[PDB]
A paper describes a structure:
Herpesvirus glycoprotein B (gB) is a structurally conserved, class III membrane fusion protein, composed of α- and β-secondary structure elements, that combines structural features characteristic of class I and II fusion proteins. Membrane merging is achieved via substantial structural rearrangements of these proteins from a metastable pre- to a stable postfusion conformation. Cell entry of enveloped viruses requires specialized viral proteins that mediate fusion with the host membrane by substantial structural rearrangements from a metastable pre- to a stable postfusion conformation. All four glycoproteins are essential and sufficient for HSV-1 membrane fusion and entry.
Here, by using a molecular dynamics (MD) simulations and sequence-structure analysis guided mutational approach, we successfully trapped the prefusion conformation of gB and determined its structure to sub-nanometer resolution by electron cryo tomography (cryo-ET) and sub-volume averaging (SVA). This proline scanning resulted in wild type (WT)–like expression of full-length mutant gB only with a proline at position 516. Compared to wt gB, the cell-cell fusion activity of gB H516P was reduced to 6.5% (SD: 3.2%), only slightly above the background level [1.6% (SD: 1.4%)] of a fusion-null construct. This fusion inhibition is consistent with a block in the pre- to postfusion state transition, functionally locking the protein. For gB H516P, total vesicle production was similar to wt gB, but the ratio was drastically shifted to 98.2% (n = 112) of vesicles displaying solely the compact form and only 1.8% displaying the extended form (n = 2), with comparable size distributions as the wt vesicles (x~ Ø = 53 nm for extended form; x~ Ø = 90 nm for compact form). This domain showed the best fit being docked upside down, in relation to the membrane, into a fist-shaped density, located about 2 nm from the membrane. DI (blue) was fitted in the leg density, connected to DII and leading to the membrane, localizing the fusion loops pointing toward the membrane. The domain arrangement resulting from our domain fitting of gB resembles that of VSV-G in its prefusion conformation, although in gB, DIV is cyclically swapped within the trimer, making contacts with neighboring protomer subunits, while for the CD of VSV-G, such domain swapping does not occur (top views).
Numbering used by the authors:
A (entry chain A), B (entry chain C), C (entry chain B): 104 to 476, 491 to 723
Write the structure that this text describes.
Amino acid sequence: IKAENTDANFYVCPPPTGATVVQFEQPRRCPTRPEGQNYTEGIAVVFKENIAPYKFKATMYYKDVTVSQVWFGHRYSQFMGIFEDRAPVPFEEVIDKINAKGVCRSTAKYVRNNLETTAFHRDDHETDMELKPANAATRTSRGWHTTDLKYNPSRVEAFHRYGTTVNCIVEEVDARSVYPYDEFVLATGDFVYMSPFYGYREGSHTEHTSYAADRFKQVDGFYARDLTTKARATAPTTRNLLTTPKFTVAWDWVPKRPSVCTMTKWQEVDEMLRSEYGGSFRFSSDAISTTFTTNLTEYPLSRVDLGDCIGKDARDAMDRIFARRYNATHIKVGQPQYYLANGGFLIAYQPLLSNTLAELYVREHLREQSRKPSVERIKTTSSIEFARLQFTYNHIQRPVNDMLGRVAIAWCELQNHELTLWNEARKLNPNAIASVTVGRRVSARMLGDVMAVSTCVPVAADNVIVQNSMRISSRPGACYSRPLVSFRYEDQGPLVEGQLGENNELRLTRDAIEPCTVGHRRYFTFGGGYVYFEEYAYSHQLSRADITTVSTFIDLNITMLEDHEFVPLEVYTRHEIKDSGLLDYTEVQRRNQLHDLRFADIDTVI
Amino acid sequence: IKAENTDANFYVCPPPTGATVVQFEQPRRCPTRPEGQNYTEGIAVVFKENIAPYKFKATMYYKDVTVSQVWFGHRYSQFMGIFEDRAPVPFEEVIDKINAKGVCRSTAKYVRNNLETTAFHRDDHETDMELKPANAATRTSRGWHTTDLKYNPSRVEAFHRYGTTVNCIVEEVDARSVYPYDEFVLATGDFVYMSPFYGYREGSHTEHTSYAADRFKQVDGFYARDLTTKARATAPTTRNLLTTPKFTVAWDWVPKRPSVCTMTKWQEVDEMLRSEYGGSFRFSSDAISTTFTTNLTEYPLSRVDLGDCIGKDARDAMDRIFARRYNATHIKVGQPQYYLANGGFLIAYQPLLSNTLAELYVREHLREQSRKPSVERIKTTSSIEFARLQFTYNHIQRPVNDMLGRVAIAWCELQNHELTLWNEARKLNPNAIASVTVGRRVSARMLGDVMAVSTCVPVAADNVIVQNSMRISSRPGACYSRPLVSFRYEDQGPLVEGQLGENNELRLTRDAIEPCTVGHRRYFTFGGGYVYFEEYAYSHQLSRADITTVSTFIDLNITMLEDHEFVPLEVYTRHEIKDSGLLDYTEVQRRNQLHDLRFADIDTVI
Amino acid sequence: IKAENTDANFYVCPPPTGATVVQFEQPRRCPTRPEGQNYTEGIAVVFKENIAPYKFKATMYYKDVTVSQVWFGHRYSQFMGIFEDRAPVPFEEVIDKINAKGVCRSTAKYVRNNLETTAFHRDDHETDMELKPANAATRTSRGWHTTDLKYNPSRVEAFHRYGTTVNCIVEEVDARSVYPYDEFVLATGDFVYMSPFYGYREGSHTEHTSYAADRFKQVDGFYARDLTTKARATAPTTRNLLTTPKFTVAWDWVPKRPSVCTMTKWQEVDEMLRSEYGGSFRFSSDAISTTFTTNLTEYPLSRVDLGDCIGKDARDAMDRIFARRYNATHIKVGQPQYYLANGGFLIAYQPLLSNTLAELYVREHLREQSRKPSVERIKTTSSIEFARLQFTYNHIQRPVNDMLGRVAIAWCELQNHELTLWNEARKLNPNAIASVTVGRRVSARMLGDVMAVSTCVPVAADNVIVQNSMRISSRPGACYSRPLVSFRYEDQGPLVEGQLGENNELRLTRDAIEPCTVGHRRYFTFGGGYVYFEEYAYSHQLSRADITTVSTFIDLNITMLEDHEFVPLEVYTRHEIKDSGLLDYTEVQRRNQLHDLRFADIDTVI
């Protein structure tokens, strides 16, 4: 049956090719300590430029060619070679054989390091073949292939003999560049360092390049050939064809598309505390818990594009801050004040003062704006409690800023604590880590010390269909890891086989097994509920709020009996050990690493 | 052995064996974005639907058979069969051979392939065998076995030759029905699907039936032979005997045991705002962090039972909340309101009102009570401050509600972080995670994405005895991993063999070996103290205050111990590398997995 | 390239051994909310005895010997032995061959099998050898060794054939006796008793000995020859020598080194509450997260040594606390009062009063110092209101105490929330755990249920070089997984081979290979930024001033590159699944076991 638990739409999890420019920054030293660094409270809005990730679509053009140095001995066959290589599809195969025809020859005539080389299909000659959707062309902006074969050259022994195979790959994919637009990403796992807007039109070819004009072939008037149709489409596209050393990329060309007003605010933070310390303005935000330790001077509208737009932005920002929380809570201090953290972090900072000691407006005004870049006839200031309450201001400055430092280092340790927590979190499930941190459905994975970022093909909780056959026995009795599922993009989507992943993840896996431990009784997150299989067969579903339908309740003292039946045996059934027998998943690992210790010992005399 | 510091009793790792499958709420969806919804605050009290597990005792009965279809070669032999099957011990063997005799024949007689096959013991015929303790326990009325090994027939080659072995299995258990009492969980590992009050008397035919009338023999007034004494130690018991298709249950029969207050006060949350939104109200709890999107109308005391006791419980809860935090803090706003969060959460909610512009009593409750389910002259109202204060009501409500929304966003993101955290936390240690989230000392394990529960027995240390020398001698060089213990369920119980798990855990199995790591010096929590084994030999315990728990005059950061060369295997040996040195469990896995790379099973010509 | 992202200093990975000095404690059950009470608000000041552990230098002396009992049969050669030992260099060879010469014979004369055996070099007679400094000439005090030499006995088959080799080792290192000074711990991973102040003079003889005076060799005016140069150094020094059973220690000797003032303020805790409960005072701090159950009376200046300095320090702590928060926040009542949180935690207290009923000072100081260790005249308290308010004070006591208890329980969870997780945090990150609790240091590890520490590492944090060789060919073509790095202890130190673990860490190992994931593009945490290799070829660094992290402005929610076919691909190419994903990372770890889970036997004729 198709999925019914509509309380949570599924996640497609194909391995992503991240960038990644978003990673957990290394935690920070904890901030400054005792008194006056003229700790100054105020609302800052911190900005950077817009990175303008121009999006479009392109298509990849190459031909993977493989040769098998089969080793024909006496009666035996060593594959002394099965070598495969991507080889850039020529402009001509695109224009005619693909764009006009939609096919690719069973021979590939390709470049390889200044040497033109040909490859054929099965010790025989050329044949155009249709680009059926590639192997693993699903789950992505599709690709198209021709076969899934390997050929063995006709048998002649006592010599390394080579059998050939040629296949085409022409693939519609999505594409992302960014300002400063001298680069772009490729939706197969590739990147090219050339300016995205480089077509010969409008002078956008005068824009950056990092390559020569011997592989860029701009067909304006091109006809976008839908590779799901292998047939042309709507009014002519300007497809640029960059014949890379491995493929060709054809893409809609567009003008340079600059970005103004590019300055885009990181954050508004009212809890913006100034520490004039270490020859530096130390801006502490407890909203994001960062001390930008920047230069003293200010940052002008001149070092940015249209500083007036950001002036509007920040004025409205600070208004939203104050009016909502501080109608009668603080007093505006001076102007917003602009500070550059290297890497272009802009701080616009309207200092604020607490209503403590309300007698010091015009005066603490001056004293703390001091940092932007006998016989007598009484002549005291019109209320010497101006000066008196200034001395009291300095007094208060002492404990107030001391408290600020203390609570700020509290914030420091809190955030530095959780930083590594989230490191281990993305170690666990970076898909979920994204589905929270950006909050959206996503395909992710951990690339060592960096992550892989993407978004997956949509599947709601009605397109997937669990299988009930839950084992492979060619390897005698190997039950699959997580529910085998036939699913589809839409009702017209391709019903394709994979395994469920944890929390509605849809991995294409259809070999993901592990031994069939008797005693299998497993829930699995199924849409907005759970599937449940008993001993590798489907028992039943259960909605999330339908299993006891409460959260943190109960006692909860449930008992059980001891070492039990369900008996594959010689003594004291073993298949529950094959269900992690205490063990202690972690100790499961800690014991199975004791098995390497035996891979010898058929090879010794004493 | 009892330690110098033992206040932590010892919870000796009995993993669940079968039931149960307790479910766990998914991370609640994190909230929305901008303002107005009425957001009307006050106390909520959620009732749960009285669900309760009935508890009583039962006992299980089945003979298993093992057969050896040996094929004998010339002097060699293949086991063309070692087959083990289970057979419910029928009514009569319980009544006589068990209740009257406590003994079990050496033949097991059971249907198989639709044919009743008999099995003997040792190719020799029926013989009643003592129920010998299949284990040693103190909690769920443990059971008894009869044999350990299987038999092989004489040598007759070139034809499948068969030798037989029969075993009996009789084991008492605790039994846990659950409201609404139609099926019940067991202790051995099976689940039975009959009503608990089901039987033959007091209209128990109306009780949930899902089994035929040929296996259930309600032999009541029928003595239960205490087989921990192998003797009837009871009044003649109300036993019901279901010869289930795989086993036999004999259990106390009880009248129908329902209870009367259908809703049970499950939660209280003073942070209860009505977010008037989405064709609905959303009861938003910033104490247990929910937003139930319930209809505007309320669940009546009519469509659930006892609409008075529940209401009184809620009234008392609300009075408690008020008196505990609001003797003069908020305003009694309207009546409480009694909504069904789908699946059966009862939400009784007495609204509140802060003293923010406290000059709107008679009206504003009135106002929000909107949401439970020619010649001329001057005539002003009695105090148009009514209308002025209502204008202000709306206008301050707006940003107030926004602030509530945002603090709730913080609420949700935090809770959803923590959920995923606990996921891997229980995958590391479900014992600790569960046992503390519940308070009970229990043993849990992974059923895919949920937990299985079994309560551990807090024992004293002296029952448990870590031996001094630990190592496996299969091949020289493997000193056991976790502290081998001779322990006792009772004070004078059987000292049985297991291994100490982490921190009063006792992994019952003993196969966990490790490098006899030359320089191995490891503590393990022993009560409130720590046991020491230097190179897998016991020195001493140390209290946690002697191993120097958290300090401040240290950290200040004086240096500590460090390590240098030793004299196996030039510069120092591998014995310590394999002691999970560093390692770094993550590093442990990432390296040790490379043993596929450390695997070469191929020796051919190329 | 040398380490240039040194916005984070780099740290080599040493082998840690710990106690630990700031040790993980276990979460605890937390007691009563409402009952036995009159919580005592006010400061406490916990003292803990500063032992002031002695830190100084020493030197280890031994000769590691090896004898190979090769097994020479027909023509083949098994090793019926490679026997490897440390023989303590005699105090004499230190005196002259090492301190006067710096040399030491190729032979060690030491007991084995209760037989004073000899060990020579290469089946020929004795010769002196030079102690060339090892890698242990750094990372502690200096150290000296010889090259990795081994000899195989002459060829005489059909008899156990024996060949010898002996290598000398002198290793000065850093040493830590800890007060109460009956002992001292070593830099090699060794402990010994017999307090190091065992010199004959100053009366230090009474200072603890655990070992007979047979091997205490006090040579005053005994310099330590610079063994990096075999030249006199360390102007003649009071060196005491213990020819331990494995080595000899030579260490500077000092007077007793007392530790007054021992008892030292652990912390000053503002929020402190006394629940006079369970026949005890329970001191609760939601200010430093503790719940001790301490003694009721006051630990006098007498029951511990020198308790006056403590009193001064506590006066200081208390006045600082008041001034920092309580100029007008609470009411002082009562003295400081001592309390023994057993295990050696002192608790001075200065009780407070909330400003609730600010009129009852004179009364309340009495009422709660009650718990330290007709013609009528209206005769009331000075104002009967005092007797009036004393009433509600009681009726204030419990509910307040209730809240006091109540909130604490919340705190309880929070505290009890995270303890074990920190333990699991190290399971990934002794790096992070140490760089937080230690602060900048690294290298902890898990010895059973205890932590292990090493804080000495001197690093040329500028000289760290990721190798541009990214493979091993032993397993033909195995790309190394973690960044191989040439580094050095000092700016001119030897660039030595190791592997760049995460975050400024250089493990001494280089074996971590992997199958070359085509398309490899990997950062690894490299100090002030990351290192990047592109398909196992150095791409570039990136400092952390330019690469994003989770924030608001332009999303930063988009998809990135997707994976597709590459050219190792028939189906499921190994090289790329290497990148920790198919999956379901945890299932990655699981299938990592699947390999033993399908094969250990090759053949058997059924």
